[PDB]
Design a protein. Structure first.
Lengths: 7, 372, 72, 372, 7, 7
């Protein structure tokens, strides 16, 4: 992703 | 007519083929391999990077990257190689001829669709495009108009309630448990028995142990006692090199983390309580039809006994006058593609495509306008 | 072998093996069925190309004249 | 085209010839003899020192030095005489005309290549040069792209795993058991039967007893019992002077030290356990292809029965579902030269040469830059 | 270990 | 060699 998780 | 392509990028597998076919022409892992060692021979025909069944075949030499994780594309230069391989080598068709249909998990980043669109029109020059929510397609596949859909592949799981073709966006649940996190858990737990797996090329071994050996217990704590007391449950598997491993009470512990994400340290509830809470967010006139039409979809739902375990543990939550049915067709690993194959063949759909003439005027943001 | 007047055992040996030799030593080495088929077909192509050049040399012998050719 | 020279310095033998030939023009021992007695006659045409087949012919008058030991060149003024003899007397070709290719055991000292390069450009004035790992060339010779190679000459033994032309440097094993240490063992053991050999000119006799009489037992302790109980195994050899010697259970004890280096007081494991451990250092996806393509190479692997003994004692270590094949072609003593002969003939290779214009810019250290 | 490595 | 063995 961009914040919460790593993707 | 030029038939449209259906290309279910998913994660971990690419499924592609022509609309109106009943199963995809191309099913290969969405994996890009680059060689890490020094090449020593000369004239070998060295090749920069390998896609799919090649990277699986040569995997011992390679580092394997998945460009999509949790349904988000994280490396576009890999992903575009995967599409290039899909159109030109695997389907052997020029995508400039006829439209293309693509599938995405709900509620993921807005920019992912814009990039997919920009790549499809700019580089691949597709005449028209659309993107469709996977869980909607699973209903087209299972032949229904009213459903709640537990769609769970590699990367991502989500519930979408649909009543008579009206989706209920406020009730859409998304969860990031998936086959890849069952695999990484199976790696961290097999170590208990001394076996060890540290590289991607053997992450791909654990991924196939999970597929053959694992199964879901109808009730967890009694089978945990059983297989702690009698060894009769344990089964053995030959690794590629010829070593035999043996797996016992473990082989039901990894798929059961779908029902207890605490095992990998997530807060959230399992697939059963997220399914029930998604039904509870729906208004009360439709709950009986949602309880009847629970549809399993995607590969992570393939474990033996996941149907009966779901029906049990939702019946433990539902009001006892209701009736609970879990619809788990054997094709279900492909149902998102089958649904997109029928969707793309409908004559009514032909208006829906985003044509290049529209994109050239509005830019890639047109997706948010004309898609869901 | 009956046609060409050769020992069956020599053809049967040499079709399936090949001989390496250094000045001091020589080795008879077996070869794959693929290499055996490539060798047989190369021998057939060589017999043909030589037969062709021979027929063309007899043509030339029938067409030549003894006078010294000044130009052509 | 100008064909390149291929000159496999090895140790103990020099093998040299032109690229594209199928066997070397020149095979002579890499040995330099100097006369030790007082020369008494006058006008004889005495000559300071002899190279190769001369020093073998006159050996009774000479002291014989090998300039290479354990694949390391230890005397450069000998070695340069050997190269001078190779180019000018034996091949009868000026090396200034066309490129030269040289072979080296892996993992040996870095300065050996720098000195070889410096001598080849400065004195012999070769237009271009390359140095190539012997065990890589043995695959070119045996017609394979995936292999593990037990290459064992005089001086040095090594295993190199290669998968589809990617070498796995972390798994390269090198061992200093060799034909010369089997020879020095055969000298120290023949003393049991009273025969004695103390000088280099008769070390060269023991070196040929070892070649003709010795063989490897399929199982050691039963043949040791047999030939201690029945004399039927013993064979006899005529020394140069006409004395007959007789050798019994001994003639299998010296080559069997390849499998038990304890006999000469080394710690390390034999060639079989180093082969298996080299496979074990490789990643598990490739081990089945390594187990199938075991390639014997170099002269010390010529002993009768070493193939069957290897296949036995590796099958004793490998997982029993695997299949183990030892590839021992009869040419194998020359396979490193044959492989270098084909390598140097590849049109793709012509870029690879270290040209003098590069060396004059980068200095002799360019080898580490442009070679393997 | 029992599989993935020598221990 | 230079240390361990004699070459
Ligand atoms: N028969 C099976 N049983 C259990 N797990 C499976 C099975 N087939 C695939 N999987 C796992 O599920 C994931 C693949 O699901 P899939 O539906 O192909 O993903 P997507 O459709 O999102 O590309 C992988 O993690 C894989 O290991
Ligand atoms: N036919 C044979 N049988 C057994 N030992 C041999 C044979 N030929 C050579 N040797 C021994 O092996 C060594 C020569 O191996 P070789 O492969 O010629 O060395 P290199 O290739 O490094 O020059 C010598 O010690 C020699 O005594
Ligand atoms: Mg899926
Ligand atoms: Mg050698």
């Amino acid at each position: 992703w961009x914040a919460x998780c790593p993707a | 007519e030029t038939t449209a392509l259906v290309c279910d990028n998913g994660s971990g597998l690419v499924k592609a083929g022509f609309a109106g076919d009943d199963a995809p022409r191309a099913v290969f892992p969405s994996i890009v391999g680059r060689p890490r060692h020094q090449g020593v021979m000369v004239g070998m025909g060295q090749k920069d990077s390998y896609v799919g069944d090649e990277a699986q075949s040569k995997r011992g030499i390679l580092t394997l990257k998945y460009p999509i994780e949790h349904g988000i594309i994280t490396n576009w230069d890999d992903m575009e190689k995967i599409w290039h391989h899909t159109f030109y080598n695997e389907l052997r068709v020029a995508p400039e001829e006829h439209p293309t249909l693509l599938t995405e998990a709900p509620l993921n980043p807005k920019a992912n669709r814009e990039k997919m669109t920009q790549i499809m029109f700019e580089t691949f020059n597709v005449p028209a495009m659309y993107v469709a929510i996977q869980a909607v397609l699973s209903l087209y596949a299972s032949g229904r108009t009213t459903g709640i859909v537990l769609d769970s592949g590699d990367g991502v799981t989500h519930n979408v309630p649909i009543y008579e073709g009206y989706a209920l966006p406020h009730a859409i649940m998304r969860l990031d448990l998936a086959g890849r996190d069952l695999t990484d858990y199976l790696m961290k737990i097999l170590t208990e028995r001394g076996y060890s797996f540290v590289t991607t090329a053997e992450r791909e071994i654990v991924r196939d142990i999970k597929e053959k050996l694992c199964y879901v217990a109808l009730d967890f704590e009694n089978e945990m006692a059983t297989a702690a007391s009698s060894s009769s449950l344990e089964k053995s598997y030959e690794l590629p090199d010829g070593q035999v491993i043996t797996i016992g009470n473990e082989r039901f512990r990894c798929p059961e983390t779908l029902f207890q994400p605490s095992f990998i340290g997530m807060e959230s509830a399992g697939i059963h309580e997220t399914t029930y809470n998604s039904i509870m967010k729906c208004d009360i006139d439709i709950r009986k039809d949602l309880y009847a039409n629970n549809v399993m979809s995607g590969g992570t739902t393939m474990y033996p006994g996941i149907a009966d375990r779901m029906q049990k543990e939702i019946t433990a939550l539902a009001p006892s006058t209701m009736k609970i049915k879990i619809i788990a067709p054997p094709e279900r690993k492909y149902s998102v593609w089958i649904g997109g194959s029928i969707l793309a063949s409908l004559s009514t759909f032909q208006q829906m495509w985003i044509t290049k003439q529209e994109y050239d005027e509005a830019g890639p943001s047109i997706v948010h306008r004309k898609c869901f | 072998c009956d046609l060409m007047g050769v020992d069956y055992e020599e053809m049967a040996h040499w079709l399936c093996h090949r001989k390496l030799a250094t000045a001091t030593e020589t080795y008879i080495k077996p070869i794959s069925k693929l290499h055996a088929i490539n060798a047989r077909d190369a021998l057939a192509k060589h017999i043909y190309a030589n037969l062709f050049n021979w027929i063309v040399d007899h043509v030339n012998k029938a067409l030549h004249s003894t006078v010294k050719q000044h130009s052509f």
